[PDB]
Design a protein around this ligand. Sequence first.
Ligand SMILES: Nc1ncnc2c1ncn2[C@@H]1O[C@H](COP(=O)(O)OP(=O)(O)O)[C@@H](O)[C@H]1O
Ligand SMILES: Nc1ncnc2c1ncn2[C@@H]1O[C@H](COP(=O)(O)OP(=O)(O)O)[C@@H](O)[C@H]1O
Ligand SMILES: [Mg+2]
Ligand SMILES: [Mg+2]
Ligand SMILES: [Mg+2]
Ligand SMILES: [Mg+2]
Lengths: 65, 301, 276, 277
Amino acid sequence: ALYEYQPLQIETYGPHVPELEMLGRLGYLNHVRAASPQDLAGGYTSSLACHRALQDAFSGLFWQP
Amino acid sequence: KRYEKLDFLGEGQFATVYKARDKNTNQIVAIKKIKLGHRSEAKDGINRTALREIKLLQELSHPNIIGLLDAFGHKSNISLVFDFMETDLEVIIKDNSLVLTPSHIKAYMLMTLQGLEYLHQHWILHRDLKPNNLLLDENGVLKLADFGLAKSFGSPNRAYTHQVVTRWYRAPELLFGARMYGVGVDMWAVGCILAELLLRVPFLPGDSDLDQLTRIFETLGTPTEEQWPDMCSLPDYVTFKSFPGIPLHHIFSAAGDDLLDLIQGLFLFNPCARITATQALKMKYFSNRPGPTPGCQLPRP
Amino acid sequence: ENFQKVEKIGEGTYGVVYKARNEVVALKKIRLIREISLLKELNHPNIVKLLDVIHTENKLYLVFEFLHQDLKKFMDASALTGIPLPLIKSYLFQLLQGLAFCHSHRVLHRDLKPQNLLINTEGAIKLADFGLARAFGVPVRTYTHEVVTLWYRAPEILLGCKYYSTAVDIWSLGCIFAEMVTRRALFPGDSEIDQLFRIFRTLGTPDEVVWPGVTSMPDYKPSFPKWARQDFSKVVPPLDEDGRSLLSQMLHYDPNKRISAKAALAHPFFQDVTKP
Amino acid sequence: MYHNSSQKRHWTFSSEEQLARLRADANRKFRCKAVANGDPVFLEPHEEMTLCKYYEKRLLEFCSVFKPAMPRSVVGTACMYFKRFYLNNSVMEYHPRIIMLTCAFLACKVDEFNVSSPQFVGNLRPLGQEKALEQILEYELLLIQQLNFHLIVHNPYRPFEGFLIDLKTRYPILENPEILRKTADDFLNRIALTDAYLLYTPSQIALTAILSSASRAGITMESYLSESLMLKENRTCLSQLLDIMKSMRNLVKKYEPPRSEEVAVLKQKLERCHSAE
Ligand SMILES: Nc1ncnc2c1ncn2[C@@H]1O[C@H](COP(=O)(O)OP(=O)(O)O)[C@@H](O)[C@H]1O
Ligand SMILES: Nc1ncnc2c1ncn2[C@@H]1O[C@H](COP(=O)(O)OP(=O)(O)O)[C@@H](O)[C@H]1O
Ligand SMILES: [Mg+2]
Ligand SMILES: [Mg+2]
Ligand SMILES: [Mg+2]
Ligand SMILES: [Mg+2]
């Protein structure tokens, strides 16, 4: 039984969040602080911070208790 | 009196683990009693490591992540209740009586990577991945455990403490003193674990931070500024003698081409370029044949 | 049966520590050889005393004199006012006597830190926590994967030397001495490399003139930054000429040139030592 | 993440009637316990609410003047802990002052804000400080049990920042969303005064604050909801979102701050109740 990758599906109850690689091209990264070279040397990019902020902004925006 | 202590599993420097039963479901559980420690840490209240484990495991629910069933205590004492795990991956690796076929290695890698992918989607870094933190149950299901070092990532200006994994599985950016990082640290640890599974011995067994860096560079070559663009800006950076490195098909002579590509992806020096858990799961090695063995068929010590 | 437990003190690497009453004493309950024997051998006013060893089939009990707090808590409480200079001198003198006694019996503490130095109400200080101790050649605990505090490690250990000498203890004591004078750690490194670089930045980078045999150490790298040696006046302002001289002799790079405990006891610094 | 968090599963409630019911149940349970132990000294639930609001304001003051600088998220976590605790417990049993200090102490440790306990207790205004530290340590485990060991608290500040980023990117109508930050922050404070944190998701609170600030500034942003958020396709969802915001604004304008003389009388009553049992 060969393995097949199946994407992880979690309901977020909010607007669709753009993919991480698309953030720079769509212009999101023009409104966040740039990552310093020291930050970049460890693998921390501004895209991660922008993606986290957007995911938190859109999480459970329309969910009713 | 809810739990009937019936076995002593082990004692670490910071906690003690016992076997018990719930007396309500007759389920066998493991109770990790957290030590107060020294006289000063006793006056600071409940241990921060126990609070970290509680707060992180209460917000996570995945098949391959250890589940916190309960937690109690008295005064500053505290005990965490987990489901009982029969063995762990280190015991499997060091057991000379059992043979690790390629399918077993693929299965152990698959479960670890799926757990890690779920963990990273929730913006949490394990930061302590090693064979003895991957616990195996009686049904052959691997679970990540020991979340005492785990931490959320993504929010800027959150360098915080410098706690790191044991040096054999530490990533070179961590050994150079990086304060801000991403999923790369867990991915390097995952590559080290895979190397341990392939060789049955630790891949890079340094005896000091500098010795660990020396072994990394002797085995995989000293990276230049094209491979690691801003490496010289890390706080604990030191220049090394240039090493050619060993070709990976010599270190892992039985590894096929797809597994070799996976290994190169996991051992890239640039943390940004290092493959993530999703990219690793999409790699051709997992979809190739033979498939991973069912968990009921995995070797048991 | 005789002992009445009063409360729980703490839970260190092994066992549990209990305040008890027979005189207030401290009881350690270990799950059930070299450490107990070493503690019986080390009888000194400046070392914590192993009173009695109660043996049970599945348990071990050790009795010690109760010390009300350790040095770390004492420095924390005195962070603003400071610790008086006579108290510093008396504590250093007593620790050096205890160290000289340990070294005379071929004992290596290896884990000196303010948290392991216990004081009482009358002004005495004693060494404790002989878990990493090295007697003659063998370690007392053959199998211990415990983390070690990094702020008091000697540079030779930081450079990979496997030959432990008594000088390492002196190094640690020197650091503690400086801390008690400055209410701050001398070398608060985040890692091994950062620890070594803080040492280098404080004392200068060691070369073959000052530390012969340093370039052949197991983890020496020629690319190490060549920092200069800042004078001791800025690193420890409050200290006097005798105290600064003793600190410098206690913080030599070369272990062979590092001062010994017995030689330290004869220093002019302790000319007018009086226990307060 | 919030969308599979314990805060969303266990600590967001359908209406303020449920909140009042749980608080009244707590008051009645304590009264039953005391009267079975063996009348005018009892406090009614609205008096308890007034006292809780007053001590929540005191906790805000304490976390504001705290040194070193207390991160705003830690303050939010502490306040949410206070609200959740006194949802199911009575001020007549556990004194709100000690509980508020314990909430701040647990929040600092949970949100990774490292402060030594002596410094934390020194932030208080001698032997009294030592006794206060003792009570805080005695109540830590009680507070954690009363929270059901649910320690992660999702605040609206991060969703606020995410919305500001999205507006700067995909809403060119707004020349500068940063003109809306001050007034939205004030509205977030006002919301935090009420019980909305137990009734709405953090993203809803942040978006309500943003749109309230826009309306006060005169700008209209229904286009952002309909167009940018793709709600023009699903109108019922838009109606639910607008009604949620209207309910939140109603909660804000209907809030009444505690009066000084009533607070003094109630403090005397509570102190007399804490010295007689
Ligand atoms: N759920 C469990 N079931 C069985 N054994 C466990 C469980 N959790 C931990 N253990 C045992 O406890 C030991 C130490 O656990 P760990 O959390 O790694 O402690 P530490 O944080 O001190 O390293 C492991 O070797 C493991 O075998
Ligand atoms: N005789 C004693 N008097 C007072 N306190 C003691 C005594 N012995 C041990 N302690 C305290 O008990 C705690 C546990 O110490 P221990 O477990 O022996 O150290 P370690 O775990 O570092 O080996 C320590 O904080 C120590 O200060
Ligand atoms: Mg472990
Ligand atoms: Mg651990
Ligand atoms: Mg110790
Ligand atoms: Mg010890």
